Each structure stands twice: as structure tokens, then as C-alpha cells.
Write an enzyme that holds these catalytic residues in place. Structure first.
Site, PDB file in Angstrom:
ATOM      1  N   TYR D   6       1.002  -1.582   0.007  1.00  0.00           N
ATOM      2  CA  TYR D   6      -0.199  -0.137   0.399  1.00  0.00           C
ATOM      3  C   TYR D   6       1.191   1.180  -0.164  1.00  0.00           C
ATOM      4  O   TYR D   6       2.210   0.996   0.842  1.00  0.00           O
ATOM      5  CB  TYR D   6      -0.627   0.531   0.996  1.00  0.00           C
ATOM      6  N   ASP D  71      -9.568   3.035   0.807  1.00  0.00           N
ATOM      7  CA  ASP D  71      -8.507   3.210   1.088  1.00  0.00           C
ATOM      8  C   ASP D  71      -7.678   2.115   2.195  1.00  0.00           C
ATOM      9  O   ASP D  71      -6.940   1.233   2.462  1.00  0.00           O
ATOM     10  CB  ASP D  71      -7.636   4.223   2.312  1.00  0.00           C
ATOM     11  N   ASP D  91       2.237  13.164   8.738  1.00  0.00           N
ATOM     12  CA  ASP D  91       1.297  13.523   8.251  1.00  0.00           C
ATOM     13  C   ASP D  91       0.147  12.696   9.426  1.00  0.00           C
ATOM     14  O   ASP D  91       0.588  11.162   9.321  1.00  0.00           O
ATOM     15  CB  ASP D  91       0.526  13.098   6.855  1.00  0.00           C
ATOM     16  N   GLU D  97      -3.191   6.072   9.231  1.00  0.00           N
ATOM     17  CA  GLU D  97      -3.183   4.485   8.510  1.00  0.00           C
ATOM     18  C   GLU D  97      -2.400   3.491   8.886  1.00  0.00           C
ATOM     19  O   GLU D  97      -2.607   2.127   8.571  1.00  0.00           O
ATOM     20  CB  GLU D  97      -2.644   4.333   7.038  1.00  0.00           C
TER      21      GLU D  97
END
Lengths: 156, 156, 156, 156, 156, 156
Positions: D6, D71, D91, D97
Site C-alpha cells: 500500500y 483506502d 502526516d 494508516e
């Protein structure tokens, strides 16, 4: 296709080490096992510094932290959780890895040496396991079609 | 407030049982523990039958299944995972329960007998634990403010 | 009943710290919050040492390990994941804690300063959150009946 | 064999985008990466409608819902969680994530551009990561044998 | 102590609704249940709108999203997963909620109407359940000491 | 490359069985599906003894336990959770497998026969699903690039 495995096995007792040797041999002959890309604890100790040969690290929190995480990582990135089980000499270490394996949704396979097959194993080990075969069944066990099955031995 | 625990402690040896009793007493004194609603394995075996008292259940898959399921249920429905630990008599069943409790977001707390405190423990046990204390601290441990900490002793 | 929280809030800037203080005050007033047993990061750094006060800990792997482990433990052992959020000063550390709290079945609640309320927030933050409220609502929010809801503002 | 990834990376700042370009190049040269069957956010925005070019969708709950889920799905179906990390411009999106990646049992790899390698990164980012390499190490990093290793830089 | 539940029960048929009402009454009488803080689906639909009362919401993706999210949130933030079950009118929605509650470490409890008790239930439902009881036992069931048990009837 | 699947499908009604047949055909023509190493419930009932043909086992706890676990194992070891869905005849069994699939981080794909595509499906089924295609889309659906998408039908 080929599946990878986490070689969960002790190396403390002579019997543990006898099984370790037979286990590797079996896995080498197995056509559905990608042994090279698998994870085996000994070959992955934190930067070669395993305690039992250069023991200052038994008290080194950093060494312990890294070795532990490296193991957990070795279980989650590989496909099968293989546990070389010896009824008479069960390992708390291996047990923890079994439960962790469960949480990671991995097929938990236990391998007991033919001589010990049948001897009562811990209840928790019996319940967590997805299947329990005899050492001699290993080399031909098809890891591409893992299935559930009860250990036909006893519990305690 | 009060916390309930899952009493993980082997009862397979004289020392283990001595620790088992000691720990049970410390908890009855602990103001932050609801022992009346805690889960204690030996008091929840399927059908109320211990396999050592009734060996005819040694290969009973239904008994094993229920007892195993009842235990996992005790871990998941309670607050704290307590593990009475004996460094030189490490239980593989307890090991598994450590990994499962870890998977359930539980606070894992090992209690080692004062005499044994300091002795090296298995790497994986040292890893999953959130904290490890002497038996003589169990009586006052504040379970409402569970914090993380390293074991003073070593690992093997 | 009363709920305990994990106080996720950055303290790396003037605005962040202003929000940090404000939120702390709202919680002390909230009848449904047990702040005395909640986990507040800055009060649980390993050895009680802040790295900004003692830069000699900047590369201390043990300090980092314990502090990190203590924090994950705070999230998993508490009821609600609170995240004090500043739209134009978004903390990556808080982001991670959102994903982990999500993994632990916790109710994720973001609190945005009244002035900042309405400003666009990161897509992923808008996603994991179970609800997002102004700082001035935190004082009365009923934590015993946590419900889901969309943020009024946008995402970027 | 080949593992998929990813591609967790920002595109907000110039530096973020500089790393993005180097990251893709490295991954193209990598023999253990199946880049075609991987997931890259930009190439997978909900039916081509990314806000920053046609911004009515910033307030569209359906667009946001779909993009978010797409996502999360991109992380759980792929093998490695790759996060192009920039110390000076962390971020919150990527952080979330990372934690989610953790819950999905994925190998979390962080890549910091050689110029920034060493700069203090957020503690949570340091703890969640399974390894942190220099951008130049990417192209030759063997994703078939993922291993644990501490970021040799600082935390904050 | 008192436990909160997630009231899983279909309302799509006469029998289901009869069971729904009956169960609701038993819980109001149960000393171990905090119904005032429990999550009941029909009282938490997005915007307070039932789709049977307002069919214009049948294809509203936002309504579906929020309602779905609110429900998952009800399961994860409450103690016990209650499932009002009708053997010959089995709800697929309830089935899903059983698997999710299982994933969240919740105690899964099925309640079958006395009349229907004994009838065969789906294999998977019989599996995930931690216990299954008649409607007439729900009034006294001790939720503070949740134990595991097999269903007396069969599976199909 | 090829992904494996868990063939989640009923066999109770005629319509269920009609879909079952079309589903297998589609999967045979699909180039990204390794159907041989996949898991299909019927072909994996506990040692050939499926109840509906030799029904003494409907009350056999051991048979039920083994069949259930074998199914859960079939979902966690395979890549995709495929659910042959029939709006008019939803299955609680399949629902549970969907939620379990979710917990195992699997791509949940639903396939509705072209004639039924559009008919309202249960809300929970709509929310758990990662995508919902028409039966005719199956054979060409690329399982190497699984993506999110809302069912364009209705809910109830």
C-alpha cells in the site's frame, strides 16, 4: 503454490533438538513449503547476538525487545505457524506464540514426534491448534489445503 | 471502582499450587479486585469435573471443547489477565493464555513468588507482559491504574 | 456510571497546549468522566522524564519502548479514546492512536476548539472518528450513551 | 516471489511529492515488489473524482465514505504497508494508516529520504514501525524476508 | 455490578416482534442489566428515521452508512451481545452481528422463545454463541458471571 | 497471480442451488482465481458425514464442533470471502461468515444473481460488504485488484 512458515521450536533439551532436526528435514522435502523465505528464530536472533553463547545480553532490555519483536514479526508475515511440540517438555515460549498466531488468523499446525504421539498435551495447546499431526506426516502434509482436525491423544 | 480478573495459574505441581493458594489470598485482600465475579478455571471445568479426578474424560473431545471455550470466555469477559508464574516450572497453557489476552486488549500481569523473583523468565513471557510483580505486592497493587513496566530479572 | 478516557492531545505548540488545557478543564466538570483513573500521557512517560526536559533521552531505545508501550496500554485499558484535534496542526502521533483505538473496539471522539470547528480535517481522521464535537460541548457530553455522527465541516 | 504494498504517501508539500517520485522509482527497480497489483491512493480515488481538482466533493459524505473505505481496503488486501515518511512534515493521515496497518497484522515499513534520515520522528511512528530504512535502501530491500529493526534516529 | 447490552433482535415479522417485546420485558426485570444505557437499534437509526416509515431512504447511502456505523458502535461499546433468535425465521443481519461481536471479544448470548426452544438452529449460529437460553430464563440470567454452554437442541 | 476464495453459499433452496452452480462455473473461467486450492464447505464436511444424508450427526456435538471450525479455518486461510447472496432468501449462516470475514481482514465480495440485482438486502450485509457485483460480472472480476463500491440496490 507454496506457503511460508514460522518454525516454532525449542532448542533447550536434547529431545527438543532431536525433533528440530527431523522437522527441518521434513520441511525440506515438502513441495508446498517455501523454506527459504520462511522464518526460523535461531537464524534471526538480533544481529547474531544470542545470549547462550555471549550472555551479557540476558539483561539487555534492547536486545530482548528486538528479539521479541523480530519473532512476532516472523509470525505475522509468514503463512503457517508451525510448532514442534514435545508432550513431555512443553514450552511456555511456544505457547505464547500459538495464542499470538491465533490472533493473527494463522493456521496453527502442531507436530509431535511419532514416539510421543498420544501422550497428553496441555488443554490450551489442544484447543488453539488447528490440527496435530505425527512427525512422519509432515513431509507430505499439503500446506495448500490446511484443514481442521482434533488431536487423537489425551489432554490434562 | 473494582476490576475482575481471569485467574491464570497452573495447579500441576506442589510449588505451583503453593503459589496458586498464596495469590488467591492476596486477591481477597485487594480493595481494587472483585473476586466474587472473577473467573477461576478450576471452578469452571465443564460439568464441574476435573480430569485428574475423573480420567475417563482424558479423550472426551466435548469436555475439552467446552472447558477450552469456557476459559477463552473467562479471559475475554474479564478486565485483567493475571498469570501466576514459576520461572523454573513454566506452564505452556499459561503461555497461550498470555497471547490470547494480548489479542483481547487485556492488561497482562505476571505475579512471581517472592523467593523466585529475579530468576530469568522466557523471552516471550517477558515480552507480552505489561508488568510483573512479586507475590507480596499483589495484595496492594492498584488495578484501577494499571501501568507498564519491565521485569527486573533477566530472560533466557 | 462513569467512563475513563485516554487523553490523546499533542503538547507540541502554543495552540495545541491551549486546547490541551481547555479540554482538561471540561473533563473535570464532566459528570460522566472518571478523570482520577484516566490515562494522561504526559503523566506516564517512562521514569517520569519528558524528553524536552532531558534531551539525553532522545535516542534512548529503552525510554522510547516503555513510553510507547505505556501509551498503547493506556488506550487498551481505558473506555474512550479522546483526541484533542487542531485542523491546521494535525499530530501524526494522534493519528496512529486513532487507528490503534479503532483496533481495540474503542469509541473514538475528536474534540475541536470552537474557533477551529468547521475547518476541513484529514480524510482518514474524519473516517476513524465515531463522532467529533466542539470544545464547549465536552463539558456535558454524555459518555454513557456514546453515539456515532458525521463532522459538519469538510475533509481534505 | 513478490509481495504487494500500500503506497502510503502524501502529496501536499513539494518535499512530500519529491519523495513520492523517488519512492515509485525505487519500487519499480525492486525485484520482490509486484507494483502493478499494489494499491496507490491517487490512482484509486473514488471514480476519478479527487477533490483538489473538482472540490464540490469536499463536503460530499458519500465521496468521503467511499474514498476512506477504498483506502482501508487497499491496506488490508495488500501485503506491506509502505509509508513514505518526511520528519519535518509528518502526516496525520499516514499515521492513522500505520495504526490500522498494525491491527491488520501487516509489516509496517517506513522510508525516510536520505537527507532527513536521523531527524527526530514522532514517538508513535517510531513504535508502530517494524523497520525504518533510508530511501536509497528501498530498491534493494528484500520484501520476502521482512525483519525488525529500530530507527537509528531520534524521537520527540 | 450491572452489564449493558446491544439488543440484537429483528423486527421484520409478527413472531420476531413478539419475541422482541417479550425479551425487552425480561431485561427490564433483570437486576444485572443496565437497560437505560444499553444500545437498542430501532432507537438509534440515523436522523431518527425508520426506512419502513420513510421509504425515500431506501437508497440513501448516507443513511445506510450512519445507521450501520452506529450499530457496530453499539456492539463494540457495550458489554454483552444479545441475540433474540427465531429458528425458522433466522435474520442474516443478526448473523453478521454475531460474527462482529465475536471479533470484539463480547459474550454472545442467544435467547430463543420458549415455544421454539429445542428446534434446530444454523450451524454457524450454534458455533459463535457462548450460550443459548429460553426467553423465560432471560429475566434472571446472571450477566455478571457469564459462562459458556452448548445448546440442547440440534443444528442443521 | 491468483487469489483463493471461501465459497460462501447456501444449498437449502432451489434458487440457492441455482446460484451455486452458476457461481462455480464463473469461478472456473476466472483467470485470477485458484479454485483448486480454495475452500468449498460441501467438499469439506467433517469426514464426509454431512447430516442431511445421514442425520444422526445433527445432535453430535463433536461433528458440529469440527464442521464449524473447519469452516472458520477455511475463511481465515483463504484470500477472499465470496458470498453467493440471494435477496429473497438471505442466510444467517452466510451472515456470520461475513462478520467473521471482516474480523479476519478479508475482502468480502457479494454476488447477487442478475435477476435479483437491485432487490433490497439486509442493512448489515450492505455495510459489511466491500463490493457487490452481478453474477454475470463474476467471471471477469479481477481478484488481483479488489476495490470498494456500494451496492446500487436498496436496503431494508
Amino acid at each position: 503454490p507454496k506457503k511460508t512458515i514460522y518454525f516454532g521450536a525449542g532448542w533447550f533439551t536434547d529431545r527438543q533438538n532431536k525433533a528440530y532436526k527431523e522437522a527441518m528435514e521434513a520441511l525440506k522435502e515438502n513441495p508446498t513449503i517455501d523454506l527459504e523465505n520462511s522464518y526460523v528464530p535461531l537464524d534471526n536472533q538480533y544481529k547474531g547476538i544470542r545470549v547462550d553463547e555471549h550472555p551479557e545480553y540476558l539483561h539487555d532490555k534492547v536486545w530482548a525487545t528486538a528479539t521479541y519483536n523480530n519473532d512476532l514479526n516472523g509470525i505475522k508475515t509468514n503463512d503457517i505457524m508451525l510448532g514442534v511440540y514435545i508432550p513431555d517438555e512443553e514450552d511456555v515460549g511456544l505457547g505464547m506464540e500459538l495464542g499470538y498466531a491465533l490472533s493473527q488468523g494463522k493456521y496453527v499446525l502442531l507436530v509431535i514426534p511419532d514416539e510421543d504421539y498420544g501422550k497428553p498435551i496441555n488443554l490450551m495447546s489442544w484447543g488453539v491448534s488447528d490440527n496435530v499431526i505425527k512427525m512422519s506426516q509432515l513431509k507430505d502434509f499439503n500446506f495448500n489445503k490446511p484443514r481442521f482436525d482434533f488431536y487423537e491423544g489425551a489432554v490434562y
